[PDB]
């Protein structure tokens, strides 16, 4: 069965909360969301999403939709947690 | 079917190559391996492995076996690409 697992969206985890104003020289679109992940024990990180980009709702969601990177000679999650429904 | 995809181990990609000596105050165990990944186009990053920790051979391999992180309020790949056989 399984994948990487952010099973979820606890109801507690509904949020978005935008760390900023309007920036310019430096500007700011921030929505933000609590999550957690499935390790060894189910758990608690924050996805600092896309501002376009509404909240995820209450469920079990997965992987890439960009999400990993290189940067350098590197996988990077740098760019962002990206989510999608448990396949 | 699919996962995250480092399908592989091209034969070219056999390596290990240890960026160092013996360190101490700062020391160094480095084995290293070329890989590539399945995006949009199949591709080319370096897994900077575990020194214990022999090379991966020529195939199609996957995900976590630690591999992602938090660090901070964060998934991190920081710690390391970790690989395993295509399930």
- Measured CA to CA, the distance from residue B58 to residue B48 in angstroms comes to 16
The sign of the dihedral angle between the CA atoms of A72, A73, A77, A83 is positive
Q: How far apart are CA A2 and CA A82, in angstroms?
A: 17
Tell me the resolution in Å: 2.3
Q: Are B73 and A48 an interchain contact pair (Cβ–Cβ within 8 Å)? A: yes
Distance CA A63, CA B44 (A): 20
Whether residue A79 contacts residue A67, with contact meaning beta carbons closer than 8 Å, is answered with yes
Q: Is A52 exposed, middle or buried (0-12, 13-18, 19+ CB in 10 A)?
A: exposed
Method: X-ray
CA dihedral A79, A84, B3, B9 (to 10 degrees): -20
Facing residue for B70 by CB, picked from A45, A70, A76 = A45
Determine, for residues A75 and B81 on separate chains, whether the beta-carbon distance falls below 8 Å.
Answer: yes
Q: Please, which residues bridge with residue A43 across strands?
A: A37
**Cross-chain residue pair A81–B75, CB shorter than 8 Å:** yes
**Which domains are seen in chain B, by residue range?**
1-87 (2.40.50.140)
Chain A positions touching B37 (Cβ under 8 A) are 75
């Amino acid at each position: 069965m399984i994948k990487v697992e952010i099973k979820p969206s606890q109801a507690q985890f509904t949020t978005r909360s935008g760390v900023s104003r309007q920036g310019k020289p430096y500007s700011l679109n921030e929505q933000l969301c609590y999550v957690d992940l499935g390790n060894e024990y189910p758990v608690l990180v924050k996805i600092t999403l896309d501002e376009g980009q509404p909240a995820y709702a209450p469920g079990l969601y997965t992987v890439h939709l960009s999400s990993f990177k290189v940067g350098q000679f590197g996988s990077l999650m740098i760019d962002r947690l990206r989510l999608v429904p448990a396949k």
